[PDB]
């Protein structure tokens, strides 16, 4: 589910400094601005990281800081673009993971009038059924979720479920 603790992406780090040094430097500037983060979590290339906050309130305060300098670099705090991702979507993204075996891409998929992609997933050699059909709806997509209800792909029947964060039990 991507975790539950609120966190922020920090970019433009001085990669010449080690990860422990960057953890201290990022913590100090927030501490100097009267903000107590809980962890820093430098990334692999050390050009970026992910700052953890105890509450959404501390996070929103952090995003409104300006001109933060660590080791000579002006770091930038970004809300990770998961809101632009399927957090808003997947009410307009369906899954029809093929329930049989390998099939053809240009197999006259006439069961969907309006959709932007029905590309399946194939591996080296044989493949199993993974084919999610995209969507272009706004108020959920129930015009297609309840409209398929057991089509007939080659081999056996098929199924249509959710993807992303909508079908997560």
């Amino acid at each position: 589910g991507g975790g539950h603790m609120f966190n922020l992406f920090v970019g433009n780090l001085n990669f010449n400094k080690s990860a422990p040094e960057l953890k201290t430097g990022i913590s100090d500037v927030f501490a100097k601005n009267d903000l107590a983060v809980v962890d820093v979590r430098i990334g692999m290339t050390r050009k970026f990281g992910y700052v953890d906050f105890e509450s959404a309130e501390d996070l929103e305060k952090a995003l409104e800081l300006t001109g933060l300098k660590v080791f000579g670099n002006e770091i930038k705090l970004e809300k990770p673009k998961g809101k632009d991702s399927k957090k808003e979507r997947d009410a307009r993204t369906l899954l029809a993971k093929n329930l049989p075996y390998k099939v053809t891409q240009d197999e006259l998929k006439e069961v969907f009038e309006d959709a932007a992609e029905i590309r399946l997933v194939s591996k080296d050699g044989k493949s199993k059924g993974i084919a999610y059909i995209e969507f272009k709806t706004e108020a959920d997509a129930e015009k297609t979720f309840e409209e398929k209800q057991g089509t007939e792909i080659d081999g056996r029947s098929i199924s249509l479920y959710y993807t992303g964060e909508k079908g997560q039990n």
Partner: antibody
Amino acid sequence: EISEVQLVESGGGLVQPGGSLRLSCAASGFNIYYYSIHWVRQAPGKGLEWVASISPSYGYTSYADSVKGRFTISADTSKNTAYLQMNSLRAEDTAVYYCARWSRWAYSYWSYKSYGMDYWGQGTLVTVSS
Amino acid sequence: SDIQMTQSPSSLSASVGDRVTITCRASQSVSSAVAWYQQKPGKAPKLLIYSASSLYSGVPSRFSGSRSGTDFTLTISSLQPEDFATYYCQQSGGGPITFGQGTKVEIKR
């Protein structure tokens, strides 16, 4: 890096052979989702024995052979807590159980090939006996 | 599991200022995913070395770790009165993590 990292174990106690006992590992000072939490037990007078670990970001879990299939490790990120439910307990499972955190978060999938167990809890006692 | 760390000598007696050597041999290649721990009675283990040669923050420099293949060595240059404990080596390169049998360092008299 500043916030006090602390692990607290609870739920230990007395359990009958063949019963089930669930341990809780409350975590503070770090995001439990992006780390790996390990359970280590130590029998009375014996050395350390690794039990299980969970890496929620990659959905990776591992168990020791002596406890494989019986134990189950899980995490509730909403509470920042890790769990170890122990089934089919035996007298040889009586030990002091610790939960530990990796030194650095799961920055890469290869992150387990370096670093070690950073912070440990107090350790709770589980006694299996009729 | 199936990856075992053969820790020797599992017990040694020494005095303050002596140079001690604790060697773990891996039954399989683990590259460098080896850590060293110090445990005192009634207390949780403390990390000393990670990546088989990197000192954890706060560990005195008299602790060190070398590697010569599948053999991992924990070296204490000058033994200190608070260093008398049990030391464990850990593997994390393969699948399940396994600890060594431990080496107890007792005072010599």
